[PDB]
Ligand binder design. Structure first.
Ligand code: HEM
Length: 291
């Protein structure tokens, strides 16, 4: 399987910037969502989920084909709760109907990070919608009740090394778990809709208590009212993971740079970009445009 990226006929950067600005204006406006957390977090998660189905072995899955749009994928249990991000994006697509799906889902993730004060994430257009039959089967997304070994193994299928995994994970500073969706309940920290290294700090600074929740699953609870999934916790149990955690706990810039790089890679997995494809775009935030 080869997935060549193909630019939406006749579109340029300015075309993309507009889709970006629309998402952003919308994020700004719909701030009541999930108790005033806003849709940032969920869009970030969505871009990760349409992208995490990839399989470096056979090149199936990944962001390319925008298959989330199909029932099989859309209804994946691991996907519970993502429908709200989709719904957020729907009208945007209606306004900009020539954008491919995979392009839109993934751009929402970039927009979300950047508008939530994260680092700039270069992004590339060119994703093409594929047929319903290219929809990966459910079961490719990772479980949360596991450990570092599982985590390592898992991310390996997506070609991510330890450093990439710890970087990516710091996105857990955003949003929160919801019982009805995954069987976990609680936020990982305090500034849940602003992008910072908070995740590492909490994991290193709080006094976590293992407990079972109402769904009868285990989670690490903190006095401050925070939580950590077993997979989150596993990062301090592993020697290799732990020192990277420490590093991010100490240097938010390092964290941002590594995150940026890992995130793009994650969203660009499985796609082939011809030599004549345009360079990646770096979008301006609203604020940079004075809007
Ligand atoms: C070990 C791998 C992963 C595990 C098992 C996992 C598990 C989870 C779970 C259980 C949820 C909460 C769902 C809910 O009840 O609404 C969650 C939410 C979240 N995930 Fe992860 N995750 C992992 C990887 C990632 C990564 C790589 C990213 C992005 C880079 C991501 C970004 C987020 C975001 C921002 C949310 C909050 C969503 C919201 O507030 O609705 N997670 N993840």
């Amino acid at each position: 399987l080869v997935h060549v990226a193909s630019v939406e006929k006749g579109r340029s950067y300015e075309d993309f910037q507009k889709v970006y600005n629309a998402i952003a204006l919308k994020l700004r406006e719909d701030d009541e969502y999930d108790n005033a957390i806003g849709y940032g977090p969920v869009l970030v998660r969505l871009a990760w989920h349409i992208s995490g189905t990839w399989d470096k072995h056979d090149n199936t899955g990944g962001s390319y084909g925008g298959t989330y749009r199909f029932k099989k994928e859309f209804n994946d249990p691991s996907n519970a709760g993502l429908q709200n991000g989709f719904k957020f994006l729907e009208p945007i697509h209606k306004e900009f109907p020539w954008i491919s799906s995979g392009d839109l889902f993934s751009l929402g993730g970039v927009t979300a990070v950047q508008e939530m004060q994260g680092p700039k994430i270069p992004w590339r257009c060119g994703r093409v919608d594929t047929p319903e039959d290219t929809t990966p089967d459910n079961g490719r997304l990772p479980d949360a009740d596991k450990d570092a070994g599982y985590v390592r193994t898992f991310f390996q299928r997506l070609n991510m090394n330890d450093r990439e995994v710890v970087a990516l994970m710091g996105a857990h500073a955003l949003g929160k778990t919801h019982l009805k969706n995954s069987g976990y309940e609680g936020p990982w920290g305090a500034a849940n809709n602003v992008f910072t290294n908070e995740f590492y700090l909490n994991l290193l600074n709080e006094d976590w208590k293992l407990e079972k929740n109402d769904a009868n699953n285990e989670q690490w609870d903190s006095k401050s009212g925070y939580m950590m999934l077993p997979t989150d916790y596993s990062l301090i149990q592993d020697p290799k993971y732990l020192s990277i955690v420490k590093e991010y706990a100490n240097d938010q810039d390092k964290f941002f740079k590594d995150f940026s790089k890992a995130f793009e890679k994650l969203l660009e997995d499985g796609i082939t970009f011809p030599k004549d494809a345009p360079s990646p775009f770096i979008f301006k935030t609203l604020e940079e445009q004075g809007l």
